[PDB]
Amino acid sequence: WRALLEAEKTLDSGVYNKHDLLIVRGQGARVWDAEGNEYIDCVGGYGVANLGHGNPEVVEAVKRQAETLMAMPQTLPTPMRGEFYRTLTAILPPELNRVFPVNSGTEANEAALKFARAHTGRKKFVAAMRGFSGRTMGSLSVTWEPKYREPFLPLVEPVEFIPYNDVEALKRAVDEETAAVILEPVQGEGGVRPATPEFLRAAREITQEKGALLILDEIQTGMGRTGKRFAFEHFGIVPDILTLAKALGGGVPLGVAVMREEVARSMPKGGHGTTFGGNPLAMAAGVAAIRYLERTRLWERAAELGPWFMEKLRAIPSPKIREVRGMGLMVGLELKEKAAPYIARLEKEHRVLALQAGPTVIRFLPPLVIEKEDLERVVEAVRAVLA
Amino acid sequence: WRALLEAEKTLDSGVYNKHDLLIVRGQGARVWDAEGNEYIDCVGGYGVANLGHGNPEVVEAVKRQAETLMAMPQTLPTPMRGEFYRTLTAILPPELNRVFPVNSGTEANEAALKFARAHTGRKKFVAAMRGFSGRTMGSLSVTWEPKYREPFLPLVEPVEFIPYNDVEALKRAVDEETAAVILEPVQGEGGVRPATPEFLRAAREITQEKGALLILDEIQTGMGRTGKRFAFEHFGIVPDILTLAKALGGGVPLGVAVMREEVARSMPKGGHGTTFGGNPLAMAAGVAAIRYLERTRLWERAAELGPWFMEKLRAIPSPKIREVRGMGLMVGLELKEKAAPYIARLEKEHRVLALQAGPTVIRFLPPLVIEKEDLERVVEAVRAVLA
Ligand SMILES: *Cc1c(COP(=O)(O)O)cnc(C)c1O
Ligand SMILES: *Cc1c(COP(=O)(O)O)cnc(C)c1O
Q1: What does DSSP assign to residue B190?
Q2: Contacts of residue A23 in chain B, CB cutoff 8 Å?
Q3: B5–A79: do the CB atoms touch at under 8 Å?
Q4: What cofactor is needed (chains A, B)?
Q5: How deeply is B210 buried, as exposed, middle or buried, from its count of CB atoms within 10 A (0-12, 13-18, 19+)?
Q6: Ligand 1 in reach of A103 Cβ (< 6 A)
Q7: Cβ distance B362 to B192 under 8 Å?
Q8: Chain A residues touching residue B119 (CB < 8 angstroms)
Q9: A321 annotated as a binding-site residue
Q10: What does the alpha-carbon distance between residue A124 and residue A210 come to, in Å, rounded to a whole number?
């Protein structure tokens, strides 16, 4: 196995800081390395494994579709695509009834930004500081992180950033020249920072009043992650374009921009496209993922375990803890010091995999099927490494 | 099946020109609609189905990996990723030894454009008129088709377009401020126009003289499509960044930017990324696709059947034919009038599925495993509809 680890490390582009291990298999919220060590996975593909590694229903759907048909373009109708379309719109508000399937979160946001420009005839985009929308140039234009943009300037213009949750700033930024406002209901990469009900309500109101579109990015908050199927359900608003990805296909690369009928209608024929977008394999996986989410009402699990887990983390008697925040099982543990060393020790000494969300934050994105006993071990492991 | 067909038509964003049938399954170069009618597929997912629909090896790899692990990020090594890296670089020139896996062709080119800017510290991109690089905003900036860009301006600047195969124009355009030149060895959507050896040699020579990178987009030409493993093998040049997708994963969404090590190391840690990029499912599919390609030296079927197929098409006794061009099984039949009506007749009257490559060109991208007898049936169908 060392040979394969070496091959990956040596031949990789090198932009990633790869950990010293080789993960070979996963089941539920657990994964094993090449040496047989078992880990509690709170990384879960960065929020992709919501339904658990190797979800039986998704695996079965993938196997059966793989034997049937994998390559069929959007110009040629295929049953699993129609099924995905009705299955996805069925779990959304009546207004979000037109689907543009893609292969990633950044592609979903790129689609949203393009549909917004075609519909409004405007150019300006308004995003939030610390907001993250993707790495391709369009999505990157509305992504805040300076280090993520600077090396690649100039990007798509014009874009204006406002402080997250700053209602007055948002009010002054949105005008008759604004094509769209793009926001995450809970900033992920930004440090696990939930939006206030007043901020999203204001975003919905101001966009409608000025003729701009509201794009809500639920690529990370969607699919039950925050305690509801979608975070917007918790805030009581319905966007003009909803972007989804990560857990949408239960692990299979899949994303989507779901929009209102009038928005979709404005797009010229042939105005946008994607080779893999809407492919039958991903459609079959998406249908299975959504059907599983619905049947199990898995979001209720995150709504219960989330608060419990966060309360346990807050109760850890460590003077190194600054705050525990988030929604459902989208959790952030902020320390009064650098988190990197503790994340490494969690992996190396406790076999608990976790992420970061800023230099002082430990982020947890465990599959929503994670057992309470495993979350207990995570709390104990965090306490141990902080001692 | 009617309900699923109508659900797809109605719930779709509407940007696609969807045909009036439902394709439910495929095997080899044949596909079936919901009524049991069998078609010869020269669309093949727009060049994705190179190894044939339901390729046994890819299907088995997909099924087995699906049961094992699907979601694992780039920060956590996983064996299939290392295997994909060494398997892919093993079939490429030694210079192309660093891989950045992605989920689509446009993502591959977005990565190429970003790595180019980071490496050179320059901004300008040079592309060819009629060139197609993708629909996300970065790739769209270097894509020519006005209908694809107009509703979304402004895009990423600065970009200068030159006529394809115009050596002198290329020499005038590439300068000390040029980060990269991006070209297809054979323009796909552009009308199936092969580059001349002179043009590509010039691109390679001028970019190195001026300090710019050469990005060769083989998303459509790669994986044996033109008679060789990769089209650049025909022209005797090696690019700085090679972009691949479509058939790379045998149908599973997969793309990649393969580059020289000096280019890869220039990218700052965290300077680029992707959630699904490099996932074990796509890596397993890619390994299997490449292994099958290598075992069967599949490009050889395209090398033998392509010239023959083009010769037969060219011999069709119709004054409506202007020229037949292409390389391997990437073929374009240019007519003196619109191709759309004939493509429709091919489908309805002969159960032959084909594409366009500009309004007057009928493009054929059949799986490379297609039977000679079926290509013969295609030639006869074209003759019939043109009569
Ligand atoms: C992960 C993420 C993205 C980017 O999605 P990719 O699939 O990595 O391109 C965009 N927005 C949010 C909120 C995300 O969490
Ligand atoms: C199909 C294609 C692309 C775009 O790839 P997607 O997977 O549709 O994003 C880019 N370049 C070329 C030459 C292509 O044929």
Answers
A1: T
A2: 69, 72, 76-78
A3: yes
A4: pyridoxal 5'-phosphate
A5: middle
A6: no
A7: no
A8: none
A9: no
A10: 13
The owner of tokens 């519909």 is A119
CA A63/CA A58 separation, integer angstroms? 9
Question: Is residue B106 annotated as involved in ligand binding?
Answer: yes
- Find, among B120, B232, B254, B137, the residue nearest to B185 by Cα: B232
CA B357 to centroid of chain Cα atoms: 13
Pairing between strand A124-128 and A178-183? parallel
Q: Residue A333 has which token pair? A: 């543990």
Dist. CA B376–CA B363, nearest whole Å: 16
CA distance A355 to A19: 12
For tokens 């493009």, the residue is B363
Tokens 């049936």 sit at which residue?
B377
Q: Which atom of ligand 2 is nearest to the CA of B134?
A: 4
Atom of ligand 2 nearest to the CA of B107: 9
- What is the DSSP-derived secondary structure letter of residue B150? G
Neighbours of B338 (CB within 10 A): 12
Considering only CA atoms, which of A133, A79, A111, A42 is closest in space to residue A281? A79
Of B12, B25, B246, the CB nearest to A99: B12
Distances (CA, A) of A330 to A75, A129, A195, B349: 38, 20, 13, 55
Q: Do the Cβ atoms of B193 and B131 come closer than 8 Å?
A: no
Strand A352-353 and strand A38-41: the pairing is parallel
In this complex, do B106 and A104 lie within 8 Å of one another by their Cβ atoms?
Answer: no
Which tokens sit at B51? Answer: 């190894």
Query: How distant is the Cα of B201 from the closest Cα of chain A, in angstroms?
Result: 26
**Backbone phi, then psi, for B15, in 5-degree steps?**
-70, -20
Place of tokens 């890296």: B85
Residue A289 CA, ligand 1 centroid: distance in Å: 18
Cβ A203 vs Cβ A214: under 8 Å: yes
Domains for chain A: give ranges and CATH numbers.
Answer: 1-54+297-387 (3.90.1150.10), 55-296 (3.40.640.10)
At A205, the amino acid letter reads E
| Residue in B3, B53, B85 closest to A7 by CB | B85
- Residues contacting residue B142 through CB under 8 Å, at least 6 positions apart: B109, B113, B125, B127, B131, B133, B159, B182
Cα A352 to Cα A306, A365, B305, distances in angstroms: 17, 12, 55
Q: Experimental technique used? A: X-ray
Among protein residues, the one whose CA lies closest to atom 5 of ligand 1: A105
Between the CA of residue A304 and those of A196, A231, A234, A307, A369, what are the distances in Å? 21, 15, 15, 6, 12
Strands A241-244 and A330-335: unpaired
- Residue of A90, A55, A72 lying closest to A252 (CA atoms): A55
Which of B107, B275, B276, B279 has most ligand 1 atoms within 8 Å of CB, for mutation? B275
User: Looking at ligand 2, which atom is closest to the CA of residue B184?
Assistant: 13
